[PDB]
Symmetry: D2
Subunit: 123 residues, 4 copies
C-alpha cells in the first residue's frame, strides 16, 4: 500500500486528525504531522502537503475538503537551510457539514512516501 | 492589473492577513477572504484558494510559505449545492522565521479574478 | 477503499496512463480521464486534478512526480457555463528516471470521488 | 511587484508560453521554464510550479486555466540528489476557449522568487 499507516504515538509520519469545534454549521478540523514526536523540516527532508477528505454518512462518494501545501524549507541562494523560513506540517480546515462521517487525511514526506490517517466526525 | 487590491472591511474579495502569534521564531498567520463582509460559497461562485508569500528583511527574493486550497462547494450527484459540504476560505499558516519581513496574500475567486493583501511581520 | 480502480458502465473515471517518451531516461507521461469517452466538464460537474506517482525499482518509498490542476469550468459573473473557458483533464509530466518502476496516477471528480490507475515504466 | 519579468533568451527563470493549437475553440498551451538556458533541478534549487492565467477579451475578470506542480527533485533516504527522479518544469494545458485573449503565466523558484511571462492567444 502506497498509503502507510502506523500508530501515531510511536510513528512520525502519520497525519493526526483532531476535531476542534462545531459552531453554527462550521466544523474545524486540525490535521498535523509529527504531533507527539516531531518530524524534520529541512531542505533535504520535509513534509510537503496534507490533504483532508470527508465522506458524510449518506454519501456514495467522499469529498475533498481541502489541501494544505507546505512550500518553504530553508532553501536560499546562500545554500540549503539558510533562508530561515520553515513551514510546519500543520493545517486547519473550516468547513460546513450537516451530517456525521469519516474524515481521511493524507500526507506526503519527500523521502518517506505517502501516509494516511482516519477519524470520525459526529454531528 | 491582475491582482485587485482594496479595503477589506469594504470589499468581500480582499484576503485578510492576521498574525496570530509571532514570538521567538514561532509564527502563526491567519488568512481569510470575506472577514467583514462574507463572500458567497456556492458551486457557481466561491473562493478557491489562498497563497501566502513571505519576504524576510535581508532577502532579495520572496518565499512562498504555503497554499490552501478550498475544494468542497456543495456539488453532488443530486445536483449543485446539495451536499452540505462547503469549505470556508480561511487558512492558518504555522511557520518559523528568523527575521521580520513583509507578508503578501493572494486569492482566487472563480468568477471575480485574483486578489491581494499585504501585512508586516514583527518578531 | 477510497480510491476506486474499476470504471463504471457508460462513465469513464479511471485515469489512463500513456508513455509518450522513454528515451534513455528522458520520460514523458500523459494522463487523461475520459480520453475516448469524454467526461463532462461543467461548473457543476468536472474533474479537478490528477496526481502522478512513480516508484523506482530499488526504492522503498514512492515519489510524487507532479500534480496538474484544472481550474476553469465555465463559471463567470454571467452564471454557470457562460465564460467559455474549460480546462480539459489531461496532463503531461516530464521527468527523468534512471530506473524502471511503477506509475500510479490519482484523480478526483468533484461529485464522483477519488480514482486510481496504474502502469509500469520500463527503461 | 513580486513577479519578476525578463527576456527569456537571456534569463532562465522566465516562463515561456507556446501556443501549440488554437483551432475552432480548442486551445493547447505549452508553458515551460528554461527553454533557452536550462534551470537546475536539484534538491536545493528548483522550479516548483507553473500557473496559467487567461483573460478572454470580453471578460471583466481573468480566469486561472490551471496549475502544474513539479514535485520530485532527487531527494531520497540516501540524501539529496540521490533518487534519480527529477521533474522537469514543463507543462501542457489543454482547454476550451470561445474567444481570443491574453495569457499570463506565473512560475516559482524556491530560492529565486516569482516569475511572469505573457503571450496572446488568437483563435
Ligand atoms: Fe520523513
Ligand atoms: Fe467572487
Ligand atoms: Fe464525475
Ligand atoms: Fe532559480
Amino acid at each position: 500500500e502506497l498509503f502507510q499507516t502506523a500508530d501515531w504515538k510511536k510513528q512520525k509520519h502519520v497525519p493526526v486528525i483532531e476535531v476542534l469545534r462545531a459552531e453554527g454549521g462550521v466544523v474545524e478540523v486540525k490535521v498535523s504531522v509529527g504531533k507527539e514526536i516531531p518530524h524534520p523540516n529541512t531542505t533535504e527532508h520535509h513534509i510537503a502537503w496534507i490533504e483532508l477528505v470527508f465522506q458524510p454518512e449518506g454519501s456514495k462518494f467522499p469529498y475533498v475538503v481541502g489541501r494544505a501545501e507546505f512550500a518553504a524549507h530553508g532553501a536560499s541562494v546562500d545554500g540549503p537551510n539558510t533562508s530561515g523560513v520553515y513551514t510546519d506540517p500543520v493545517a486547519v480546515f473550516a468547513f460546513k457539514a450537516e451530517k456525521s462521517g469519516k474524515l481521511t487525511a493524507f500526507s506526503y514526506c519527500n523521502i518517506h512516501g505517502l501516509w494516511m490517517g482516519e477519524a470520525t466526525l459526529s454531528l
